[PDB]
């Protein structure tokens, strides 16, 4: 079964967002990569953080990320 | 820019 | 896929007797303002003054996801460019 995320590229002043649903077992690395691709920014240098300024360790299940932080995440592109 | 991923078909 | 489902719209420029059209596939969570801008450009008409209406004469509020528009009004939409003044 899947969990879903709203990822907002907050560095784009238009605040465009994308929704992603992945199987709750999916490693969060996959979502980071997916989000990077859809947002057309480097997976290697991009981070995903929460609304409250907590950095999300991607070596974690999407399921566990959802359980701890909810659906509202920001993608942070490097310099 | 198409930052919302709209596709033409 | 991880990427959100898409909804598709057939947008017709009824003002052209040929009734030309463009089909747009758009992520459900996309604000309808993006769809309107995208459509206006495909039709080479000013996004800021054009409107999208249903086949039954309802104006679509752009502050609204594509998903909602799809669900409430289906896929047949019309694009309405403004006349000129003077």
Curated annotation (Swiss-Prot), chain A:
Gene3D superfamilies: Phosphatidylinositol 3-kinase Catalytic Subunit, Chain A, domain 1 (3.10.20.90). Keywords: Cytoplasm, Disease variant, Isopeptide bond, Leukodystrophy, Nucleus, Ubl conjugation, Ubl conjugation pathway. GO terms for cellular component: cytoplasm; endoplasmic reticulum; nucleus. GO terms for biological process: brain development; negative regulation of apoptotic process; negative regulation of protein import into nucleus; protein K69-linked ufmylation; protein ufmylation; regulation of intracellular estrogen receptor signaling pathway; response to endoplasmic reticulum stress; reticulophagy. It comes from the Eukaryota. Belongs to the UFM1 family. Ubiquitin-like modifier which can be covalently attached via an isopeptide bond to lysine residues of substrate proteins as a monomer or a lysine-linked polymer. The so-called ufmylation, requires the UFM1-activating E1 enzyme UBA5, the UFM1-conjugating E2 enzyme UFC1, and the UFM1-ligase E3 enzyme UFL1. Ufmylation is involved in various processes, such as ribosome recycling, response to DNA damage, transcription or reticulophagy (also called ER-phagy) induced in response to endoplasmic reticulum stress. This is Ubiquitin-fold modifier 1. It comes from Homo sapiens.
């Amino acid at each position: 079964s899947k969990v879903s995320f709203k990822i907002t590229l907050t560095s784009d002043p238009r605040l465009p967002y994308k929704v992603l649903s992945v199987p709750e077992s999916t490693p969060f690395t996959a979502v980071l990569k997916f989000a990077a691709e859809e947002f057309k920014v480097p997976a290697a240098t991009s981070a995903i953080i929460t609304n409250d300024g907590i950095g999300i360790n991607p070596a974690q299940t999407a399921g566990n990320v959802f359980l701890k932080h909810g659906s509202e995440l920001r993608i942070i592109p490097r310099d | 820019d198409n930052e919302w991923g709209i596709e033409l078909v």
